[PDB]
Design a protein around this ligand. Structure first.
Ligand SMILES: *[C@@H]1O[C@H](CO[C@H]2O[C@@H](C)[C@@H](O)[C@@H](O)[C@@H]2O)[C@@H](O[C@@H]2O[C@H](CO)[C@@H](O[C@@H]3O[C@H](CO[C@H]4O[C@H](CO)[C@@H](O)[C@H](O)[C@@H]4O)[C@@H](O)[C@H](O[C@@H]4O[C@H](CO)[C@@H](O)[C@H](O)[C@@H]4O)[C@@H]3O)[C@H](O)[C@H]2NC(C)=O)[C@H](O)[C@H]1NC(C)=O
Ligand SMILES: *[C@@H]1O[C@H](CO[C@H]2O[C@@H](C)[C@@H](O)[C@@H](O)[C@@H]2O)[C@@H](O[C@@H]2O[C@H](CO)[C@@H](O[C@@H]3O[C@H](CO[C@H]4O[C@H](CO)[C@@H](O)[C@H](O)[C@@H]4O)[C@@H](O)[C@H](O[C@H]4O[C@H](CO)[C@@H](O)[C@H](O)[C@@H]4O)[C@@H]3O)[C@H](O)[C@H]2NC(C)=O)[C@H](O)[C@H]1NC(C)=O
Lengths: 207, 206
């Protein structure tokens, strides 16, 4: 039996309207003794069944069970630990897994847009670059937009640990060379806890 | 008694002068029964040996044995498969692991240098950006230099799959703003199999 603990999506902890959740998944549960017991704790507290919510599901020759715990935005941002305890009779001792926001002081992300290289202009599609650096923790959300509509032909690298101990990443938005020199304006949105309203936006366009 | 096969460093296989190698790591070796016997095969052949060489041990609470096999640059680029057979008494049957370079038409990387944003011109240090996209397979090596000398403060993101099936990455070199204002020339070096001579350079300066 193996247990996996997943943190909330970065974007869920940053918007009050969204529902951030910590997901505890157990696999290789005995096909013979599928009864699984879950206990959740926040900073060591609440053996006593609280919120949470399990389900179940049969697989190869085993069972898979998932429990989801809704977390409070500020609880997560304040570094509270979420512990998932899993018990099964076909197991010696219960399996424990804990997860929290990475420790350290939040650092505000620096966002800069970079137009495509002149040499790339011979191509039919160009690259609009958004650089995000100096941020911490690594949890972050980046998106693009031209008008109000979201742009979807973009790719973002995973965050990279930098020398100062902070993280950086780049996002690449690909558009038709025409849409660019025509004058259209683009912008990458960046969501991070260390930003004023957990959100900033930088514009990009030729001139 | 777990086995992990690793491929050669991208750079080692692109320059004849270097020595590319495939490495077969063996973790959780029983403190009781180390004695690990390796077996390597290149496209099936070998075992009556040809160039293997294991070494060292011990770790946290268990042993870690590692076998290194030197490869012919050409054999690795041609897509030959490398197989590591690991044997140990405390292991029922011999665990085998195969490895080879990603398959598919190699694609030439486009290299573009991007100057620091006007907005960043306010910090003491600035970011020189090297965008490398459209390449395949993902094995690539990127480096920065200035007037013939290698730069120290740069970081390269790992390869990211692009929408069209090829890869891209960004390399970032941080330098004192003065060095950029003084007009010094900085260069992004890229090493990939689909480039003529497996190498290309792109310069940046104010
Ligand atoms: C004794 O210590 C061993 C290693 O100890 C080091 O690493 C940590 C354990 C540290 O806490 C500290 O103890 C030491 O610094 C333990 O063995 C480890 O076992 C795991 C899985 O059993 C291996 O994980 C693999 O890692 C490779 C990547 O390796 C490279 O990167 C790491 C760092 O990121 C380096 O340390 C390595 O040298 C390599 O450069 C993965 O590619 C590999 O693939 C995955 O396999 C798992 C299956 O387990 C899949 O689920 C995934 O999808 C992937 O396919 C795998 O993740 C560690 O490499 C290995 N440690 C090393 C480096 O040899 C050992 O467990 C511990 N006690 C025991 C149990 O004896
Ligand atoms: C029996 O069947 C189980 C479920 O079957 C899945 O597999 C395929 C082949 C079909 O059989 C389908 O029915 C079904 O998709 C198998 O369970 C699997 O067990 C592995 C562990 O051995 C789990 O892997 C873990 O995944 C984590 C990420 O999960 C998320 O993403 C995957 C897609 O990539 C989704 O499916 C999940 O739902 C999640 O959204 C990953 O974080 C874990 O990695 C971490 O831990 C390892 C150590 O184990 C470490 O090396 C690594 O660095 C990380 O720290 C880990 O890889 C897998 O999730 C689970 N399958 C599913 C769908 O939940 C079971 O193995 C199979 N056979 C046996 C012997 O039981």
């Amino acid at each position: 039996p193996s247990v996996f603990l997943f943190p909330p999506k970065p974007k869920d902890t940053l918007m009050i309207s969204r529902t951030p959740e910590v997901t505890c998944v157990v696999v290789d549960v005995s096909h013979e003794d599928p009864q699984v017991k879950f206990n959740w704790y926040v900073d060591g507290v609440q053996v006593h069944n609280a919120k949470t919510k399990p389900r179940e599901q049969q697989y190869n020759s085993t069972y898979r069970v998932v429990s989801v715990l809704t977390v409070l935005h500020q609880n997560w941002l304040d570094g509270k630990e979420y512990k998932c305890k899993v018990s099964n009779k076909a197991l010696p001792a219960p399996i424990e897994k804990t997860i929290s926001k990475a420790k350290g002081q939040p650092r505000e992300p620096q966002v800069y847009t970079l137009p495509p290289s002149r040499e790339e202009m011979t191509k039919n599609q160009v690259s609009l670059t958004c650089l995000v650096k100096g941020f911490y923790p690594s949890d972050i959300a980046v998106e693009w937009e031209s008008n109000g509509q979201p742009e979807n032909n973009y790719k973002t690298t995973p965050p990279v640990l930098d020398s100062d101990g902070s993280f950086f990443l780049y996002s690449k938005l690909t558009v038709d060379k025409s849409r660019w020199q025509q004058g259209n304006v683009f912008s990458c949105s960046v969501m991070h806890e260390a930003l004023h309203n957990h959100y900033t936006q930088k514009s990009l366009s030729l001139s």
